[PDB]
Design a binder for these strands. Structure first.
Ligand SMILES: [Zn+2]
Lengths: 101, 67, 25, 213, 136
RNA sequence: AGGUCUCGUAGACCGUGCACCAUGAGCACG
RNA sequence: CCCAUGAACGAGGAAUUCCCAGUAAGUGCGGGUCAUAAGCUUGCGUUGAUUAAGUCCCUGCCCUUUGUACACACCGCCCGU
RNA sequence: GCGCAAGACGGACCAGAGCGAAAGCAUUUGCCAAGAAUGUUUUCAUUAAUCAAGAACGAAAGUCGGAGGUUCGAAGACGAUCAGAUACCGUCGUAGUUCCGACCAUAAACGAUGCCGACCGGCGAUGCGGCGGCGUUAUUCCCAUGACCCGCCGGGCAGCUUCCGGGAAACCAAAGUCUUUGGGUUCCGGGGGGAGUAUGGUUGCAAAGCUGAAACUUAAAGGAAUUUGGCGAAGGGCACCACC
């Protein structure tokens, strides 16, 4: 039967979307179907930031950040706990979850 | 390390949840006597009151998960 | 038995029968 | 059999007179072992340095390329080779729900220097703007790109390398572009992303003498 | 073999190229010119096990060995050149890079500016594997 | 003239990954 | 009941059991079994602690959501030579 | 680390955004040609949608001729996994994957919903063109321009709610205006197999494409949605016969 109002993607007037490769896998997934992960991290986060802070020749030296973007296949997205499954009535919530941490 | 560091005193302010795999460790908001401004989070072991004074060896690191 | 490999085997059988017919005549 | 660091030397590299601090580091090279000389092997080296390691207090995420081509003994003198940006700043400037404008201009200076000036550009959401999109039309992007092209080909051919290296140290061309393209679309984030040097003239030692002062 | 000028409060600067894949960890130390390396150690140098080639502990051993080596050689200021496997493969650096950097800092060494110099492509060729990928 | 500005708190991830799954002899009662 | 004979055992591998206050543990006394009868069990009494006011990691149990071509209900149904 | 050479592809910007009849389309610049929508007190005056024969285009794979072979990689070779692997995995690797011309016309070519036209609720945003109106900016004065805000109009990709209504229900502003059954017009379905099979015709170098049965057998095969169930599915809670 019909599961969602859309078809698991965002293609509405296109027909063909330029496929992309997965990160953990190598699946040829379409661009609007894959789950996109954009994580903002730095080089060291908690176990070495003070150890660098008293080992740097420049005082008040801010650590540079690392910016990567991840494309996930759906099986890789479920297997890596990126996205979960909800109930029938709770599926139609397009708002992102509150990023408290 | 090969560095010397003086013993810095500490004081808890509010007890937090208990971390660890078996619930052995405890999170607590802990604060320094000689530096009233700064306050860090440290993992403690054993039963803690809501204002007892604490002895800490290193003031550089921060608390984390059970891992 | 999904229909794709059933159709593949039936196509191979049809090709074998046709090529037997053209070797016979 | 023998330790390789016994037959080694130590040399000092000198920044040119366009900068402020002439000492940026030290390098090492082997002795004149046999028929080969240690002079040419010390020549083809590219010294990546930051802007804050050259001047006092400025933008610290600007990188410069320095190459040596002359030695005289226990000392090396460098020359400009290119200008780049750090990767974290480049990844930090790009974000969703805005447009990116890029262009490249091939320019020739008064000397034998065929450069290649790149650029970036990102539109700015207004302070009272309610729309989350903030995109631009294609012809507006074409006009802004043509304006950047003519600005970057306006200021190179009529003048030499030294004062345009001096002009590249602060935000001058980017501020001129952002002031010029304000009426078309109010972009805010303008930088010269990468400077590449293609062609070399015939090398003569007097230019390297007067370049370092 | 050693720095000729006396180091009263200043320091000499070299670069250290950390290259951390998902199955190896490279610590490569080179002068500021980038051409002349001085010493290199890998994660397979300090362990007799092919599986633990990209380990935090092997990274600590390699970092301590290379820190000691440049300590008798005479380099005390390092510029970190961190790198993942790059290319058409993944861009996240290996877990041994952080442990190697922390162990290099713990040896009593001064560092300068750190950055990531991983070779990200614009658009490279086809990735290794099939259309359905490396399924398991 | 003073010297330790005041008030409240999740600020938590980060060498972590798992092989080895073939088959079901049947089946009541009003 | 009395006298002689005086072995192993020098605080025990892998593994595993029980227990938050008059508790565990030490200690003795009653009852059942009984002609003769407690190294067992059930009650009683004396002395009397260390640790903790949590967790879901292990071992199990319960609930919600989701998938199903299973309803004699996965020890189920079921495709091909 | 410095250069050189070759081929492939245009990330991040990239969206329930745009264009195209559909396949499909993403570096900059130049040339040629076409088109929707908006505006119009311009022109012709019924010239109109659907359409058997017929005609163009048509993803990938496959075929026919050659400098192209960088990466990837059907068959093939090797090593492990396994009771048994010529499967999942790893290393090489032919034909292809790239271009120019000659072919075939098949997909879940799916919005699993033919085309034109009329009527029937609201709301908030998006893209194009036009219109009106406080204010800010390209510094301070004046005009219109680009950017922003507040409305409106027409077309389009779309979103939320309901006793408008319908449906077997999932659900639907169309899948509504249907026993109170008629707006116009092409293609197509009659239980499940046999079977898209045999034969004939037709097209093609070939692979195959279109047209397309019968005999025999069967009382079921199927579509929605509830209750414990069963997951080598994800969470949450409890327990000194679980742990610290
Ligand atoms: Zn994947």
């Amino acid at each position: 039967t019909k599961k969602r109002r859309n078809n698991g993607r965002a293609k509405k007037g296109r027909g063909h979307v330029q496929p992309i490769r997965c990160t953990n896998c190598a699946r040829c997934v379409p661009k609007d179907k894959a789950i996109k992960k954009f994580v903002i991290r730095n080089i060291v986060e908690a176990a070495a930031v003070r150890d660098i802070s008293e080992a740097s020749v420049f005082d008040a030296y801010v650590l540079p950040k690392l910016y990567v973007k991840l494309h996930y296949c759906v099986s890789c997205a479920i297997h890596s706990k990126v996205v979960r499954n909800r109930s029938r009535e709770a599926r139609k919530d397009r708002t992102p979850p509150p990023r408290f941490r | 390390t090969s560095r010397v560091q003086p013993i810095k005193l500490a004081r808890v302010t509010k007890v937090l949840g208990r971390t660890g795999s078996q619930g052995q460790c405890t999170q607590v908001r802990v604060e320094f006597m000689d530096d009233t401004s700064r306050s860090i989070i440290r993992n403690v072991k054993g039963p803690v009151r809501e204002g007892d004074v604490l002895t800490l060896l290193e003031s550089e690191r921060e608390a984390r998960r059970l891992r | 038995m999904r229909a794709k490999w059933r159709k593949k085997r039936m196509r191979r059988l049809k090709r074998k029968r046709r090529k037997m017919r053209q070797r016979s005549k | 059999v023998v330790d390789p660091f016994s037959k080694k030397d130590w040399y000092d590299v000198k920044a040119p007179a366009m900068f402020n601090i002439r000492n940026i580091g030290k390098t090492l090279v082997t002795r004149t072992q046999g028929t080969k000389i240690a002079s040419d092997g010390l020549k083809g080296r590219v010294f990546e340095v930051s802007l804050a390691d050259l001047q006092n207090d400025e933008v610290a995420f600007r990188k410069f390329k320095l190459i040596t081509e002359d030695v005289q003994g226990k000392n090396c003198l460098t020359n400009f080779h290119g200008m780049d940006l750090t990767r974290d700043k480049m990844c930090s400037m790009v974000k969703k729900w805005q447009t990116m404008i890029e262009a490249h201009v091939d320019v020739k200076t008064t000397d034998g220097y065929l450069l290649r000036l790149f650029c970036v550009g990102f539109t700015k959401k207004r302070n009272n703007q309610i729309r989350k999109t903030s995109y631009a039309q294609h012809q507006q992007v074409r006009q802004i790109r043509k304006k950047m092209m003519e600005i970057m080909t306006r200021e190179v051919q009529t003048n030499d390398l030294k004062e345009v290296v001096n002009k590249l140290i602060p935000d001058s061309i980017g501020k001129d572009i952002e002031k010029a393209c304000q009426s078309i679309y109010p972009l805010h984030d303008v930088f010269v992303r990468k400077v590449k040097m293609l062609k070399k003239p015939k090398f003569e030692l007097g230019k390297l003498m007067e370049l370092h002062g | 073999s050693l720095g000729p000028q006396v180091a009263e409060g200043e320091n000499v600067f070299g670069v250290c190229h950390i290259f951390a894949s998902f199955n190896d960890t490279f610590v490569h130390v080179t002068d500021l010119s980038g051409k002349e390396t001085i010493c290199r150690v890998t994660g397979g140098m300090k362990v007799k096990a092919d599986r633990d080639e990209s380990s935090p502990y092997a990274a600590m051993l390699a970092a301590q060995d290379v820190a000691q080596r440049c300590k008798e050689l005479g380099i005390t200021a390092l510029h970190i050149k961190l790198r993942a496997t790059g290319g058409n493969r993944t861009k996240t650096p290996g877990p041994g890079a952080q442990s190697a950097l922390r162990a290099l800092a713990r040896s009593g060494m001064k560092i300068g500016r750190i950055e990531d110099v991983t070779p990200i492509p614009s658009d490279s060729t086809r990735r290794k594997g099939g259309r359905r990928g490396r399924r398991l």
